[PDB]
């Protein structure tokens, strides 16, 4: 089976603001990647091995709204640009890659999986360059190897006059390290 | 929800269609020059290519287009009309070998279907099953390029 994905909006602006302030979200959770939002920006969080990871430059040091109130971060690594909370009850976790593949696939917030060629521990080139506008909102999303295993989390794009030619990611390795710190 | 793959049928047979780049493509040996039904009447083919066993109508309602592959991978996946996925390794620009041969019946009715890459992008359109004594060991397919050039 090839990599396919679909997205579902679970809540709207106003319901999002209320939940943000209250910290109590009773909605049912499903999926490996959650579309996440703050009152200032929206991005993605990826559940890998029981932990819901995301990009520090999006979540900052905030708590995640849950059905039992706000949940404090499990890991915060300003340097690795990582933060992680216990994966919400109901989400499914990805498992780290163990095949050293150089053919990666990026999953965007619009549930599109675009191929990227690994060209370093943190960079991979888009086989088909796309407008930066396409990647907006996808930071924290996953980069899977052909087996559908976590290779890294999208962190920033390498834009050239508005077109994304490559991407910077946080390889799974930095996660284990962040957990050991 | 919207489907990329339409299960279609003519008085004589049943096969599949795949929407790619806004067109609903299928095999000429299934549809011929037939028009596709629509609640506002039959809509004629935009592209008919007998030479390539390729035809196409404007993508119907309840459909969503599939993305052409751009990773070159040779690890293809064929989707049957029963929604089954069959890992097919690429042996050439228009042919591939099933990683596990299945009786020809398993692939019966799936022509027009898509051959996806590891990213779920269209690599080609399933043209015909290559079977030896009733065992489909390989498949013939119309690569996306043909679709792309026909447009």
């Amino acid at each position: 089976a090839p990599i396919t994905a679909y997205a579902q909006q679970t809540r709207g602006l106003l319901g999002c603001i209320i939940t943000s302030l209250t910290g109590r979200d009773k909605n049912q959770v499903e999926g490996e990647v959650q579309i996440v939002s703050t009152a200032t920006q929206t991005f993605l969080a990826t559940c890998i091995n029981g932990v819901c990871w995301t990009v520090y430059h999006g979540a900052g040091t905030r708590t995640i709204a849950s059905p039992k109130g706000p949940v404090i971060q499990m890991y915060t690594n300003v340097d690795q640009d990582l933060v992680g909370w216990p994966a919400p009850q109901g989400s499914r976790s990805l498992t780290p890659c163990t095949c050293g593949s150089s053919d990666l696939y990026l999953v965007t917030r619009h549930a599109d999986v675009i191929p990227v060629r690994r060209r370093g521990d943190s960079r991979g080139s888009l086989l088909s360059p796309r407008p930066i506008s396409y990647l907006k909102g996808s930071s924290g999303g996953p980069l899977l190897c052909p087996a559908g295993h976590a290779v890294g989390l999208f962190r920033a794009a390498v834009c050239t006059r508005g077109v994304a030619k490559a991407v910077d990611f946080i390889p799974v390795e930095n996660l284990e390290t962040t957990m050991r710190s | 929800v919207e489907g990329e793959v339409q299960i279609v049928s003519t008085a004589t047979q049943t096969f599949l269609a795949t929407c790619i780049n806004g067109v609903c493509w299928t095999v000429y040996h299934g549809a011929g020059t037939r028009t596709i039904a629509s609640p506002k009447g039959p809509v004629i083919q935009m592209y008919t290519n007998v030479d390539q066993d390729l035809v196409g109508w404007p993508a119907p309602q309840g459909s969503r287009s599939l993305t052409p592959c751009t990773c070159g991978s040779s690890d293809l996946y064929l989707v049957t009309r029963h929604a089954d996925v069959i890992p097919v390794r690429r042996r050439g620009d228009s042919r591939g070998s099933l990683l596990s041969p299945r009786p020809i019946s398993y692939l019966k009715g799936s022509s027009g279907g898509p051959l996806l890459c590891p990213a779920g992008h269209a690599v080609g359109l399933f043209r015909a099953a290559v079977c030896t004594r009733g065992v489909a060991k390989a498949v013939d397919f119309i690569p996306v390029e043909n679709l792309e050039t026909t447009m």
Partner: peptide
């Protein structure tokens, strides 16, 4: 600062399926 709130999901574990009627 408030809490990060989930507003959607992306499911990868889904497989091809014949849309019901």
């Amino acid at each position: 600062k408030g809490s990060v709130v989930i507003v959607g999901r992306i499911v990868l574990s889904g497989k091809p399926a014949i849309i019901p009627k």
